[PDB]
Amino acid sequence: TSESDTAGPNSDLDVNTDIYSKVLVTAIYLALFVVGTVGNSVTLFTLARSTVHYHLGSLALSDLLILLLAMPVELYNFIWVHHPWAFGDAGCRGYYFLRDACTYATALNVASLSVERYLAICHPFKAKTLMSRSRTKKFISAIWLASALLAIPMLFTMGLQNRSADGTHPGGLVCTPIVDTATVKVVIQVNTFMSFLFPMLVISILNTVIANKLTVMVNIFEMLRIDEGLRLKIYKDTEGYYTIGIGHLLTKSPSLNAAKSELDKAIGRNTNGVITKDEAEKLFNQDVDAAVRGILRNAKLKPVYDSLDAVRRAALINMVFQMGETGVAGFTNSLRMLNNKRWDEAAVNLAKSRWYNQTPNRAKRVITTFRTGTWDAYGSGSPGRVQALRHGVLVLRAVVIAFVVCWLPYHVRRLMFCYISDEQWTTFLFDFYHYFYMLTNALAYASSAINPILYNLV
Amino acid sequence: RRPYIL
């Protein structure tokens, strides 16, 4: 009415958020937009010049698109001027489509980034030969393609709507879901589960598995470098064979030139019968996963290996390294004792075996490891290598913590929007929801500035 | 009054 009143009967759409909080959120938003712009750009710019950056570069793009596309509009029509929507029906359908499609791309990348890491650390014989530049290329194109398909429902759920008390007005046009609560409910759930819960489970599970493998590699390194011995020259095995390094069986052929011949199909130089320390650990890392694979494809060794902690797994690998998959699987009562976590019982029975009599000094160190779950029988260890272990664990935790700290309140807010029915919305829940809106999204935007810092420390 | 901003 009036045609002379601009702010008409739109009182039911008003939001009572203070201008002081608006100033604070805008300042917080300006800080996040500045850091996130440079951080994601520098990561994206320096990339254009080991395919683990293709995922990092993909993540660096999606975080930047969130700051450039969704942040300005939200700062105007969702923070400062809640109504009316100043971008039309096409803008209403387009904004919520892109904001969700890019949110998927970030969440799916964060998951896919840790998937490649899991395939790089926990499985060295399935990735070194199977991943190509072409596979990783299209794998990322599928991430963006699936993210755009999952955001298609937003083109139908959202839309322009006039909620002014007057039949017609301009100040009543709002960008709100144009479907019933049941349809809004289903759309928000599938969105919430797919992005939030799929990564959160995939991120936290795979990262926990990565932390154990890295701890095993730190434990198995010193245990075998002490018992098996590190020798940079060719020496004769106890059984009369040619070995080198950390017990790298070269060949059973008695020809020394043939042993020198095979000694460098893996090393890559001519050497003339000598290798370096860094080369020995490369042969060691290959010989370790071979023992790990035989343990995993064995049904008599895997249940024991799974129930053991990181330290006791190294003791098992220590035994598999010396005797083989069959020789260790010959132990059948002790493995069941190790499976029941009866350490003192298993420690005594192994002291009866032939393997304990052949190498008494080493067997006690392996047995003592099964007793205490610590490597104290091998000393304190190398502090330089063991600290890099502690670094990577906290980084894996940071990736999990940042994803939940930044995106849990965001999805929780949208659940409030559709699950609190009409009868439960008091005046306080309305004002809280809009103050709650500022906090959840500032945390959501923070991931666009935090990720270029975390994932560039990996 | 349910909110309209998602």
Residue numbers in the entry:
A (entry chain A): 43 to 91, 100 to 268, 1002 to 1165, 297 to 372
B (entry chain B): 8 to 13
Anything the authors wrote about it?
G protein-coupled receptors (GPCRs) are highly dynamic and versatile signalling molecules that mediate second messenger responses within the cell. Binding of an extracellular agonist causes conformational changes in the receptor, triggering activation of signalling partners such as G proteins or arrestin molecules on the intracellular side of the membrane. Constitutive (basal) activity is defined as ligand independent activity, resulting in the production of a second messenger in the absence of an agonist. While the pharmacological and pathological properties of constitutively active receptors have been studied extensively, the structural basis of constitutive activity remains largely unexplored.
Here we report the crystal structure of the constitutively active NTSR1-EL mutant in complex with NTS8-13 at 3.3 Å resolution, and the pharmacological and dynamic behaviour of the receptor. NTSR1-EL contains the wild-type residues E1663.49 and L3106.37, but also has the F358A7.42 mutation, in addition to A86L1.54, G215AECL2, and V360A7.44 found in NTSR1-ELF. For the structure determination of NTSR1-EL-T4L, we obtained well-diffracting crystals using the chimeric T4 lysozyme (T4L, cysteine-free bacteriophage T4 lysozyme with C54T, C97A) approach, where most of intracellular loop (ICL) 3 is replaced by T4L. Superposition of NTSR1-EL with NTSR1-ELF reveals that it is similar to this structure (root mean square deviation with a value of 0.6 Å for Cα atoms, excluding T4 lysozyme) indicating an active-intermediate NTSR1 conformation. In particular, TM5 shows an outward placement away from the receptor core when comparing the V2685.69 Cα atom distances of NTSR1-EL and NTSR1-ELF (3.9 Å). TM6 displays an even further outward position when comparing the V3006.27 Cα atoms (7.4 Å). In NTSR1-ELF with F3587.42, the W3216.48 side chain is oriented parallel to the lipid bilayer, whereas in NTSR1-EL with the F358A7.42 mutation, the W3216.48 side chain is oriented perpendicular to the membrane. As found with other constitutively active GPCRs, NTS-induced activation of G protein is reduced in NTSR1-EL, in contrast to NTSR1-ELF and the wild-type receptor (NTSR1-WT). Comparison of the crystal structures of NTSR1-EL and NTSR1-ELF18 and molecular dynamics (MD) simulations show that structural rearrangements within NTSR1-EL, combined with altered receptor dynamics, may facilitate the initial contact with G protein in the absence of agonist, while the loss of correlated coupling between the binding pocket and connector residues may explain the reduced effect of NTS on signalling.
